[PDB]
Each structure stands twice: as C-alpha cells, then as structure tokens.
From Swiss-Prot:
The chain holds residues 1105 to 1314 of 1327 of the full protein. Poly-ADP-ribosyltransferase involved in various processes such as Wnt signaling pathway, telomere length and vesicle trafficking. Acts as an activator of the Wnt signaling pathway by mediating poly-ADP-ribosylation (PARsylation) of AXIN1 and AXIN2, 2 key components of the beta-catenin destruction complex: poly-ADP-ribosylated target proteins are recognized by RNF146, which mediates their ubiquitination and subsequent degradation. Also mediates PARsylation of BLZF1 and CASC3, followed by recruitment of RNF146 and subsequent ubiquitination. It is found in: Cytoplasm; Golgi apparatus membrane; Cytoplasm, Cytoskeleton, Microtubule organizing center, Centrosome; Nucleus, Nuclear pore complex. Belongs to the ARTD/PARP family. Residues 8-204 form the PARP catalytic domain. Oligomerizes and associates with TNKS2. Interacts with the cytoplasmic domain of LNPEP/Otase in SLC2A4/GLUT4-vesicles. Binds to the N-terminus of telomeric TERF1 via the ANK repeats. Found in a complex with POT1; TERF1 and TINF2. Interacts with AXIN1. Interacts with AXIN2. Interacts with BLZF1 and CASC3. Interacts with NUMA1. Zn(2+) binds at residues 130, 133, 138, 141. Ubiquitous; highest levels in testis. Phosphorylated on serine residues by MAPK kinases upon insulin stimulation. Phosphorylated during mitosis. Ubiquitinated by RNF146 when auto-poly-ADP-ribosylated, leading to its degradation. Deubiquitinated by USP25; leading to stabilization. This is Poly [ADP-ribose] polymerase tankyrase-1. The gene is TNKS.
Length: 204
C-alpha cells in the first residue's frame, strides 16, 4: 500500500516546503480560536506519500482535466488539514466526506496559507482540540497537515457564498473569496504529496 519517504532537512525540497509553510502564516479573523496562537511552526518531520493506486488515479484525472483546460493542469501546491489524514494517505481524498459546512458548497477544501489548514487539524472550528489536553492552541501535541498537488484545471471565481455540489460547467474547481479558498469536487484532483508533522510554537 502506501509508502512514506522521509525527507532530510538538508534536501532543498524539505527547505522549500518548510519555507512555504513558515512564510504563509497569517492572522485569522477568529483571533486564533480554531488553530491557536503562533508566528512560527516547529517542523518535526516531512514525509513524501508514495501510493501506486493513488498516483494512478491522480494521473488519470489529471489527463482528463488537461484536455478541457487547453492542455494545462493548472496544478498548485496547497494545504489541507483534517483529523483523518491517516485515512487520506491510505485511501486518498473522498468527496463523499466533503466539508458539508463549507462556504462554497460540499467539496474538498484547500488553502494557500498553512495557518488556514491548521485550523482544521482537530476538526471543524478546531473541534475540542487535541485528544490529551482538549486545547486547540496546544504547543505540545504533534499535528499533521498535507501539502498537496492540486489539479485546479479551469477555476471558477466565486465572490459569494453559495452551495455548489460540483464545479460550474466547463470548470474543474472553485476559487472562493478574506483570502481565497480552493475547492475541488472530485477526490482524484488532489494528491497528498507531503505529510508534515509539526507543532505550533508559542510566541516569545
Ligand atoms: C473530516 C472533517 C472533520 C468532516 C473535515 C471537514 C473539513 C475539512 C477541511 O476542509 N479542511 C481544510 N484544510 N484546509 C482547508 N480546509 C477548509 C478551509 S481551507 C477537513 C476535515
Ligand atoms: Zn495537547
């Protein structure tokens, strides 16, 4: 099944992913309620997910999208957080477990900003936080999030909240607008490329 490759801190690839993660921390409108308070992550581990069934399904989808998007994937690296990352890296994304409460409909959601996704690591609104301390801003418990290859194909820009079950005709994804949220409606338009294990760090 799924094989995890551990990246070394010396690898440029490691240093790019951590750079994307550290440099996209923002202040969120809920004052850090869901995701905690921090200016930095402490990155513990970065692992590359290798799964043959999933790579195959991703590629397949990727080709269909290319055809309808002038032979462009429009692939982006985006974050995703969920308390079921473990099911994700073994069975892929599953739109049947879509974010029912999502602003732009029932799809699978991704962020440019790591701090956005981190808000969903323990559940929606941050849930009741970590299992041990029930603390959404815990600094001890290890969190995991995904930095994913996401096939956006042709994106539809939505500036209003609106329940969508699927992308608009001729489109493969929705970009919704504070900051943009990227939504896909098919699980195979995302591959969980990097599994990041980390902590949020208490500001000094
Ligand atoms: C399994 C349950 C708890 C239903 C679930 C529901 C929604 C999400 C999710 O959408 N997470 C996420 N990661 N990055 C972003 N988001 C949404 C904003 S941008 C993850 C898990
Ligand atoms: Zn904890």
């Amino acid at each position: 099944g799924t094989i995890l490759l551990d990246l070394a801190p010396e690898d440029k690839e490691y240093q790019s992913v951590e750079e994307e993660m550290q440099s996209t921390i923002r202040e969120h409108r809920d004052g850090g309620n869901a995701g905690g308070i921090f200016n930095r992550y402490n990155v513990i581990r970065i692992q590359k997910v290798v799964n043959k069934k999933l790579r195959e399904r991703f590629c397949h989808r990727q080709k269909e999208v290319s055809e309808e998007n002038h032979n462009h994937h429009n692939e982006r690296m985006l974050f995703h957080g969920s308390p079921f990352i473990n099911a994700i890296i073994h069975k892929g994304f599953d739109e049947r477990h879509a974010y029912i409460g999502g602003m732009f409909g029932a799809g699978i959601y991704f962020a440019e900003n790591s701090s956005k996704s981190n808000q969903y690591v323990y559940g929606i609104g941050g849930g009741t936080g970590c299992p041990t301390h029930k603390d959404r801003s815990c600094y001890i418990c290890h969190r995991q999030m995904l930095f994913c290859r996401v096939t956006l194909g042709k994106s539809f820009l939505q500036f209003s909240t609106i329940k969508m079950a699927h992308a608009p005709p001729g489109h493969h994804s929705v970009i919704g607008r504070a900051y943009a949220e990227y939504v896909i409606y098919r699980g195979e338009q995302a591959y969980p490329e990097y599994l990041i294990t980390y902590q949020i760090m208490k500001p000094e």
